[PDB]
Amino acid sequence: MTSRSPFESFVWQSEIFNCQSNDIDAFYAQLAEEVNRLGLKKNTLGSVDSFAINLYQSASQRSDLPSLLISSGFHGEEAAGPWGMLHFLRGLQPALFERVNLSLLPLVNPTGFKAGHRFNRFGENPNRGFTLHTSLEGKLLLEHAQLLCAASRDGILTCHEDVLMNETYVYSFEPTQTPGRFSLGLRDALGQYFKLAKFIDECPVTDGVIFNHFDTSFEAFLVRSGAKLAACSETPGQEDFDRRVQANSAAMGQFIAHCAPI
C-alpha cells in the first residue's frame, strides 16, 4: 500500500511550446499544423468529451517498407510524451515516409491530459486491460485492433513518464533471451538526458531496462499480436519539462534510426 494518489494532477510550463502542459487546444492546433505539412492522413478512432482520438498515417502503406507505430498520452500526468511527439514531428520532413510506414497515436487519453492526471475523467486507466478491464479509450482502440496491429508489425514505441522519478528507464520486448541493440540503443538515447535507474511490480530494472515483462498494457498486447519489437520509454517527471520533451523526441528518433535505418 502507497499514499500517493493516482487521481493527483500535475502540470508544467513549456518554453518550447510557450504554454502549459495541459493546454489541449494549443496541442491540437500545433499538431494539426504539423500533420498538414507532413501530408499525414487522419483516422479518427473515437472521441470523448469532444476530443478526437486520432491515428495519423502515410497516405498509403507500402508493403516493402517497415511499419512502425509511436503512441503516447495514455496517462494524462505524462504530458512530455504527446508534446515530445509534436517536437519530433516539427523536426521531420516528408522524405522520412519514403522509407517507413510511420503511424502516430499522439494522445489516447485527452480527458486525463486536459486535467493533468493519469486516469480519464471516468477514473479508468487507459493502458490496462488489453488482451482482446479496459477503459473507454481502450475499447475504442480495440475496435481498430487489426489496423493497429498492421501499424506496429515492425515495431511499436510508447512514450510514457514516471511522474515521481528523477531517473530514466525503458521497458523492452524482443524475441531473444537477452536485450539487444534495439533495447540498448533506446536506453542509451534516454541516458544522454537523464541518469539511468539502477523495481517495477517486483520486477528488477537492470541497467535501465525492464525486459520482456508482459502485462495487460497496449504495448504487450501488440507484441502478443505479432509486433517484432516494442518499447515503452519512461522519462522522469520530477525533471525539467522541456528536457523531457527533448528526451522523448530523442527516443523516437532512435526508434526510427534502429527500425527504419538509412
Q: What is the radius of gyration, based on Cα positions, of the chain?
A: 17
258 touching Ni ion, by CB under 5 A: no
Our CB check for Ni ion shows the closer of 117 and 160 to be 160
Strands 41-48 and 51-57: antiparallel
75 touching Ni ion, by CB under 5 A: yes
- In SS3 terms, 30-93 reads as HHHHHHHHHCCEEEEEEEECCEEEEEEECCCCCCCCCEEEEEECCCCCCCHHHHHHHHHHHHCC
- Applying CB under 5 A, the span of 3-11, 25-33, 70-78, 88-96 interacting with Ni ion comes to 70-78
CA-to-CA separations, 102 to 169, 185, 186, 230, in angstroms, rounded = 24, 19, 18, 14
- Which one from 124, 174, 234, 239 is the annotated catalytic residue? 234
Binding to Ni ion (CB under 5 A) within 172-231 occurs at: none
What is the smallest separation between the CB atom of 41 and Ni ion, expressed in angstroms? 27
The pattern of x and - marking residues 143 through 172 that bind Ni ion according to CB under 5 A reads -----------------x------------
What is the smallest separation between the CB atom of 190 and Ni ion, expressed in angstroms? 15
Our CB check for Ni ion shows the closer of 75 and 114 to be 75
Our CB check for Ni ion shows the closer of 8 and 33 to be 8
What is the smallest separation between the CB atom of 253 and Ni ion, expressed in angstroms? 20
Our CB check for Ni ion shows the closer of 97 and 173 to be 173
Contact 217, 128 (CB under 8 A): yes
Active site residue 234: yes
Question: Which triple of cell numbers denotes residue 108?
Answer: 489516447
What is the smallest separation between the CB atom of 163 and Ni ion, expressed in angstroms? 8
Contact 42, 97 (CB under 8 A): no
Q: How far apart are CA 186 and CA 232, in angstroms?
A: 10
Our CB check for Ni ion shows the closer of 160 and 228 to be 160
Tell me which residue has cell 487521481.
Answer: 7
* Number of residues lying near Ni ion (CB under 5 A): 3
244 touching Ni ion, by CB under 5 A: no
Q: How far apart are CA 163 and CA 10, in angstroms?
A: 8
Q: Which residues are designated catalytic? A: 234
Instruction: Using CB under 5 A, list all residues that contact Ni ion.
Output: 75, 78, 160
